[PDB]
Amino acid sequence: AVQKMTRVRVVDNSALGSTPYHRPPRCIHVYNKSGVGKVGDQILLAIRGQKKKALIVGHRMPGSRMTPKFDSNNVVLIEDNGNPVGTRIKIPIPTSLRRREGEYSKVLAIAQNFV
Partner 1 sequence: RFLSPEFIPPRGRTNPLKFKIERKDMLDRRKVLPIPEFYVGSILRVTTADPYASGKTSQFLGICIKRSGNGLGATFTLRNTIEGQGVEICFELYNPRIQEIQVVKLEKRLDDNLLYLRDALPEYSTFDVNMKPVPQEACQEVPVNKLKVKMKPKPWSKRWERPNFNIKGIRFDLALTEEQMKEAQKWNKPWIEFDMMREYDTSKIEAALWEEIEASK
Partner 2 sequence: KFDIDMLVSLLRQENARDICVIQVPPEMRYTDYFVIGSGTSTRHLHAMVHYLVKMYKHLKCRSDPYVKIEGKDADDWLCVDFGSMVIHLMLPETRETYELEKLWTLRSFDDQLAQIAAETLPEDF
Query: Could you tell me the sign of the dihedral formed by the alpha carbons of 64, 69, 74, 78, in that order?
Result: negative
Residues 46-105 that bind partner 2 (CB under 8 A): 81-83, 86-90, 95, 98, 103-105
Nearer to partner 1, 19 or 95 (CB): 95
Burial of 97 (0-12, 13-18, 19+ CB in 10 A): buried
CB of 67 to RNA, least distance (A): 11
104: left (phi over 0), alpha (psi -120 to 50) or beta: alpha
Distance of alpha carbon 60 from alpha carbon 31, whole angstroms: 19
Distance of alpha carbon 63 from alpha carbon 61, whole angstroms: 6
Q: Which does residue 17 touch among partner 1, partner 2, RNA, none (CB within 5 to 8 A, set by kind)?
A: partner 2
Q: Which does residue 4 touch among partner 1, partner 2, RNA, none (CB within 5 to 8 A, set by kind)?
A: none
Residues lying near partner 2 in the complex (CB under 8 A) are found at: 7, 10, 12-13, 17-25, 81-83, 86-90, 95, 98, 103-106, 108-110, 112, 114
Q: Which residues bind RNA (CB under 7 A)?
A: 32-35, 62, 65, 101
